[PDB]
Design a protein around this ligand. Structure first.
Ligand SMILES: Cc1cc2nc3c(=O)[nH]c(=O)nc-3n(C[C@H](O)[C@H](O)[C@H](O)COP(=O)(O)OP(=O)(O)OC[C@H]3O[C@@H](n4cnc5c(N)ncnc54)[C@H](O)[C@@H]3O)c2cc1C
Ligand SMILES: Cc1cc2nc3c(=O)[nH]c(=O)nc-3n(C[C@H](O)[C@H](O)[C@H](O)COP(=O)(O)OP(=O)(O)OC[C@H]3O[C@@H](n4cnc5c(N)ncnc54)[C@H](O)[C@@H]3O)c2cc1C
Ligand SMILES: [Cl-]
Ligand SMILES: [Cl-]
Lengths: 539, 528
């Protein structure tokens, strides 16, 4: 009679979980206040999300999830309406000034982690919702949750329409408005998080490529276009994203995702301005951004937020789980959101199914999911807070950037090797061993990385508290980078004067040779391979 | 400052018009109570909408509109999420019986009118909205219109949010909930319309091809698959549509639009059943349909309507126009809605731009728009009412089917020829001349067609009233078909025994030969 699981929120987190549970013969109800199709933000993918999507798909036997793990599979299976992401781009702007071409950074994503996308979320979320319903999930859309009641036998969810849903377990896969977080008072008030930012964002038609509106010397031009990736316009205590859906030949979607993050402590609310007027007031500060957006028109009602950050004291209890985005949020910066979502679905799914099967809901079974959830948010907090502090001074940012981007290659390889070894042998142990790491939520959980990132964090926070200058901090971190032995030297991560990291087959072969003889066992374990093996992997 | 035009409704009708006006430099506001993306019904295209989309695009210089006129251009420019429509398929079903393979119709759409599509309307409507804004239309979404107030100088639209919009002209491009039709008391109550039907519809995943679930003898299989077009499951005083979006290799959209039309005088309201329950209670009547939909699951909240038909006493005034779907509606049958929409945009757009330029809003300039609006509805009403009556007797439907479909090529080539003339001469003259026909709103407005359709209508209504037998009507109409000289003989339209009309290159060439030396001037003018 009762549902096994009621999932509140029919976005990607809810429908990926619902697809896994429904495919394995469980009885699922998806509840959402909205109806597909609908706009959702969280558009840019990273290497980690790609490999973890593939990992979830293989581990739980849901092919539809692996179709989100590459630009090619999204186009072929979801819709034509998505953009490519070959790179992360960063460009510093000062008020009334042209951008300095020596204050840019680019990370071109290596082929081995896969081909990143700009997700048009209305289509990815419709796609996974249709998959969830096809696997046997029941759904109620335009369904507002008013009340959640727990007893010894399960949970009762009451709608505004006067109806009730009875289930054995509740997953809240909503956002800030999480009905469960409100019902149980799970929100930390005030929030423990150090990062401060509010947002203004929309979708625009007629956004130009930044590549066509900057006066850059031929030799300082990036190896791949800015417009082929996620462009980050950096300024004092804020940044603006430019995420085109039309940045490839014969792209059907003419839209561009556009938003600004502002630290609300340094940029106070302007309720006298409309969202759009406040957006353009920031555009008009930066001549090159003004030229890029000159013909850009909003095709949506603007979103303008207060401080966006939130955190929870508890994310799992008896017969309930708070999914990543319902538990906490930092910032769009670095697109950690969808990675965190995938880490939690991987860890939760087999634990929840074992609990449902045994009919045992002891919170002890979900202890790792709590630890991972809080760890992801706290590590994500430091990375973004460190970046926002560094935006005041490029030589400081320059260290943040290569420490972040180096870990993205080492971290991705770690998850890809585990997945590869699990497919070769059929032994799930290689994937389960990922959970046995000392730093749950850290994207590259190795002692030498933890130590480098702790020192980065200590110095950035010192700059923010006024204990040290951005210059002082930049000098110390630049020397540490220059003294490093682990920062993938063939790719240029250990060279502060290399601003555009451009992986090529030749450099990836050299990394494998460099790794073979390395004194660090983790470098050998993750990166060591013959020339022939690296070519075999790139086929 | 003031807008030139405020358009209420950001569906295709509103954004195609806003795109036209904004491209010609007029200042446009689009208001809508919803936000893109959003589901809309009206998914199947016909020859007439394709050729009139091409006409609008070429005549008003908006290329985006022409990308709706071809399955290939829809996939290349809108999104991958649309299906193909190679044909109209018709299958008769009786309660508890297998479909009779001698009680089916197919009209395969000829190359000349173009490649029809199954529109995933969330994507077409998003595309035209994006085009309209790019041309320079302003827009407010989640905007609920509370009051519309005209004066000598223009109109004021008041919003729930306490804001107002000032413009010189208002177009209502919404639907049945038209605020202009409501606030001005424009609705005919009761409606003058003869057709009666209510609807239940949704989008489903896991709908199979009917081709794979019927035991048809090889020699009675259609030239092209049923699943490659819009299938109509016909029964006593009702029909069901299957409009797949996945009916082509490497289709990205797995959904299928499914809906049932019921004459509510013959099938009274079942408020004891959920919409889904009432839908399945009709599926369970017909074993073949039941097998097709066996694994099908809905991905939307179901829509269930009361009687869907509505009409208006007036569709134009001083500084306002009621756009086709805001003015009236008959039925999804034969997909006339988007044709009606395109015809009105073609007739309205040049007159309106002339009025804005001259700052003269005398309603007499818009008299033809009114005549076309009411004419489309009246002719559409007869087409569908005649069809619903004929569903009781296949031999009678067989006559309705060929009289309707024979008009596709003839009415199609009429609009093509006018478009070709205007392209070569560069004179809008030859498109304006389409407004000078003697039967505004009739899809083939020639005396010999008007007379043939008039007789079909008189016989069908006499069957409905019980004055003439369905059998009597079928024999008289079968005789008129067999004795006709105009019903494109080479395609089999004049042959009641030809159920599957399959226009090939060989047959279309023969049509051209036969036309060249025809006694009727219209046949020569159109098909030679
Ligand atoms: C401005 C912004 C930018 C971001 N950018 C990125 C990025 O670039 N990359 C990235 O990886 N991540 C990004 N993120 C994070 C990203 O949004 C999430 O990680 C991702 O969308 C996960 O979505 P979800 O399925 O968990 O939930 P969502 O997609 O947020 O689903 C929320 C659902 O909750 C429902 N709901 C709410 N209240 C109720 C109720 N009472 N009853 C019923 N239903 C209810 C709503 O109807 C809605 O459908 C961004 C986030 C924000 C806010
Ligand atoms: C069940 C059904 C099936 C149909 N099937 C077909 C078919 O197969 N083929 C075909 O050619 N035609 C079909 N039609 C007809 C077709 O739907 C219309 O001709 C077509 O949608 C016209 O488009 P539009 O832009 O005028 O209106 P719509 O598509 O109805 O869009 C109207 C817009 O106005 C907005 N709006 C509505 N009310 C208000 C308000 N009060 N205030 C503000 N905004 C408002 C809506 O949010 C929406 O965005 C069908 C119609 C129905 C009802
Ligand atoms: Cl994020
Ligand atoms: Cl219609």
């Amino acid at each position: 009679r009762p549902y096994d699981v009621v999932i509140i929120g029919s976005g990607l987190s809810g429908t990926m979980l619902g697809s896994i549970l429904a495919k394995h013969g469980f009885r699922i109800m998806l509840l959402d206040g909205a109806h597909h199709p609908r706009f959702a933000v969280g558009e840019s993918t990273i290497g980690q999300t790609l490999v973890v999507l593939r990992l979830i798909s293989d581990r739980y036997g849901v092919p539809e999830i692996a179709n989100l793990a590459s630009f090619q599979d999204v186009l072929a299976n979801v819709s034509s309406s998505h953009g490519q992401k070959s790179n992360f781009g960063f460009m510093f702007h000062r008020d009334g000034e042209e951008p300095d071409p020596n204050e840019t950074s680019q990370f071109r994503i290596p082929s081995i982690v896969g081909n990143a996308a700009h997700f048009f979320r209305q289509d990815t979320d419709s796609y996974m919702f249709h998959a969830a319903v096809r696997y046997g999930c029941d759904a109620r859309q335009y369904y507002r949750v008013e009340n959640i009641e727990f007893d010894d036998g399960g949970v009762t969810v009451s709608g505004a329409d006067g109806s009730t849903v009875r289930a054995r377990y509740l997953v809240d896969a909503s956002g800030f408005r999480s009905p469960l977080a409100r019902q149980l008072g799970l929100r930390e008030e005030p929030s423990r998080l150090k990062h401060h930012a509010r947002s203004i964002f929309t979708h625009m038609v007629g956004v130009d490529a930044i590549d066509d509106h900057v006066d850059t010397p031929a030799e300082l031009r990036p190896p791949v276009p800015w417009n082929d990736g996620t462009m980050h316009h950096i300024f004092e205590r804020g940044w603006m994203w430019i995420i085109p859906f039309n940045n490839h030949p014969g792209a059907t979607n003419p839209l561009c995702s556009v938003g600004i993050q502002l630290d609300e402590r340094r940029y106070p609310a302007r309720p006298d301005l409309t969202p759009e007027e406040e957006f353009w007031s920031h555009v008009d500060r930066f001549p090159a951004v003004q030229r890029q957006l000159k013909g850009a028109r909003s095709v949506r009602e603007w979103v303008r937020t207060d401080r966006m950050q939130y955190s929870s004291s508890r994310t799992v209890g008896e017969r309930w789980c708070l999914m990543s985005h319902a538990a906490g949020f930092i910032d769009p910066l670095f697109s950690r959101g969808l990675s965190n979502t995938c880490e939690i679905i991987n860890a939760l799914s087999w634990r929840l199914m074992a609990a449902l099967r045994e009919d045992d809901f002891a919170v002890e079974r979900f202890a790792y999911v709590e630890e991972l959830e809080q760890g992801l948010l706290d590590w994500n907090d430091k990375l973004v807070n460190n970046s926002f502090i560094s935006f005041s001074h490029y030589p400081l940012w320059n260290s943040v950037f290569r420490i972040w981007a180096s870990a993205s290659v080492i971290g991705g390889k770690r998850i890809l090797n585990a997945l590869t070894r699990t497919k070769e042998t059929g032994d799930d142990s290689h994937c389960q061993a990922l959970d046995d790491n000392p730093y749950p939520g850290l994207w590259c959980p190795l002692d030498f990385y933890k130590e480098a990132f702790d020192e980065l964090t200590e110095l950035c926070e010192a700059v923010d508290a006024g204990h040290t200058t951005a210059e002082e901090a930049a000098r110390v971190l630049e020397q540490r980078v220059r003294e490093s032995d682990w920062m993938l030297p063939a790719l240029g991560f250990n060279d502060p004067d290399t601003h555009h990291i451009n992986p090529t087959a030749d450099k990836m072969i050299r990394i494998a040779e460099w790794a073979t003889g390395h004194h660090r066992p983790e470098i050998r374990e993750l990166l060591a391979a013959s020339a022939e093996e690296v070519r075999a992997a790139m086929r």
